[PDB]
C-alpha cells in the first residue's frame, strides 16, 4: 500500500491553486501506439476517480518551436470547446501519423475535418478563455518543475510514480495507478 517514494513522490514546494488532478502530455513525445497507451490510462483513471473529482490535462511544447506553441494554444481551444476526445488522436496523427500538421492552418483543419466549424475555431483561438488557459499550461509546468511527460500530479502536492507500480501488464498497472490517485485525492 501507499508510501512516499514508492507509488508517488511529494513536491518539495507544493503548488497552491493547482488542479485537483493534473496530467501533462506532449504531441511530440512517443510512438503513436505509446501515445495511445497513455490515453487509455488517462481515460481509465478518469473512469475510476470518485464522483466530483475532475481531471485536468495540459499540453507541453517540449522543443520550444512555434508549432509546439500553436498546438498548446490549439489544446486550450479543445478545452475551451470541450472537444478533447474528438481531436486528441487526429492532432497527434496530424503531427505523428499522417504528418499533415505543419502550420497553424493545418491544425485548424484537423479540428474542421473533425467537425468543428472554422468560424468556431477562430473565436475560441482569439478568446480570453484560451489566453488564460495558455498561460495556465505554461505556468503549471514551471510550477511543478516539470521533468518530463507523461506526468500526473495530485493537488499540486504529489506526483504519481509509475516506477513504484507493477507495469508488467496494463490492467494491473492501470488499477494501481488509478487506486493511488484516489488515495492522494483524499490525503
Structure, described:
By secondary structure, the protein is α+β, with helices and mostly antiparallel strands. The protein has one domain (1-187): Glutaredoxin. It contains 7 helices and 5 strands, in the order E-E-H-E-H-H-H-H-H-E-E-H. The protein has a 5-stranded mixed β-sheet. The longest helix has 17 residues, at 32-48. It is globular, with a radius of gyration of 17 Å. 29% of the residues are buried. It is classed as oxidoreductase. The entry lists the keywords disulfide, thioredoxin, thiol-oxydase, oxidoreductase. The assembly is monomeric.
Please supply descriptive tags for the structure shown above.
187 residues, alpha+beta, Glutaredoxin, 5 strands, 10% strand, globular, DsbA/DsbL
